[PDB]
Amino acid sequence: LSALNPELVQAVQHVVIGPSSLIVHFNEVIGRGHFGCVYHGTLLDNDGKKIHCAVKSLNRITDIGEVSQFLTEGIIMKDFSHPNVLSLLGICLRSPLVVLPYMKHGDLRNFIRNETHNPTVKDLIGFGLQVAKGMKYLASKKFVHRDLAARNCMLDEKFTVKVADFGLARDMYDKEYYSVHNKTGAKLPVKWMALESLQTQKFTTKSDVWSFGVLLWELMTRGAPPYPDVNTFDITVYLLQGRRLLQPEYCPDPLYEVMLKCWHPKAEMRPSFSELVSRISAIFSTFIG
Ligand SMILES: NC(=O)c1cnc2ccn(S(=O)(=O)c3ccccc3[N+](=O)[O-])c2c1
């Protein structure tokens, strides 16, 4: 709207998609989050070719400061660029819309839960490897994801895994797994959170590593829910007692060791994503398919 700083407006120019270049099919919803519903759309680029996109309508913006923060991040997130991270194609201002590349196979969790598919143990470990490669990138940019999970990674038509659900695309795409803190009101995916994050609400790249370990366990169970018989808030106690996710039936031992390392109670003794890329590449390499 009109109250926006013009210099900020000028700084975001290169992110902004104009209505003439974007066709959104608003009659069908393909995805839903908290902050908006998601629709298929086509983006006319330089050449006049249709880029297939997922377009999100941000429904809960109430004031102009929220919009400015939204543009400010748009500018940051547009510079991010890795094969295993979901890119931002841009934003439509003229509801604001977030334009993302369309991901043919949807979120990684629904993909592996879908019983018509048979991803092998090698394929599953490959998906995890790809996640670690994108997280390696993000961490190199000293960006903390805070909500890494298989529901928040996407899969494209070539089965490239894209880490998603951060920046302008950040949402709860499955609200079942988020709780509210008694004394701060933040929305917490508790069963993916590191011990320290549950105790002191502090997030770091090493707490991204904890979540990555839970994500690997998701892969090895083909998307079973973690701690099914541990209630949301009994989880801190469960972990503080020195207990962890059990090894999945078809999880190879060396990968379970990787997981367990990811959940070390000392953030600093957890491996880095660069070490996870190395070690998981090795594990992936020892399978046939
Ligand atoms: N729902 C879809 O078919 C679809 C296809 N492609 C994309 C690309 C992004 N989304 S999303 O926003 O809805 C989404 C959906 C679930 C998890 C995360 C994300 N994310 O991009 O952050 C997509 C959704």
Supply the key terms:
monomer, two-stranded antiparallel sheet, 2 domains, Phosphorylase Kinase, domain 1, Transferase(Phosphotransferase), domain 1, alpha+beta, six-stranded antiparallel sheet, binds the ligand NC(=O)c1cnc2ccn(S(=O)(=O)c3ccccc3[N+](=O)[O-])c2c1, 289 residues, Hepatocyte growth factor receptor, 10 strands, globular
Oligomer: monomer
Are any ligands bound, and if so which? ligand ZZY
CA-CA gap between termini: 54 Å
Radius of gyration, Cα only, in angstroms?
Answer: 20 Å
Give the class-level CATH name of the largest domain: Mainly Alpha
Number of strands: 10
Strand content: 5-15%
Q: Kindly state the percentage of residues in helix.
A: 25-40%
Largest sheet report = 6 strands, antiparallel
The chain-level structural class is alpha+beta
Order of helices and strands: HEEEEHEEHHEEEEHHHHH
Which shape, going by the Cα principal axes? Answer: globular
Number of domains: 2
Number of helices: 9
**Can you say what the CATH homologous superfamily of the largest domain is?**
Transferase(Phosphotransferase) domain 1
CATH-level-2 architecture of the largest domain: Orthogonal Bundle
* CATH fold title of the largest domain: Transferase(Phosphotransferase), domain 1
Domain Protein kinase: 24-288
Family: Belongs to the protein kinase superfamily. Tyr protein kinase family.
Active site: 147 (proton acceptor)
Region (Interaction with MUC20): 263-289
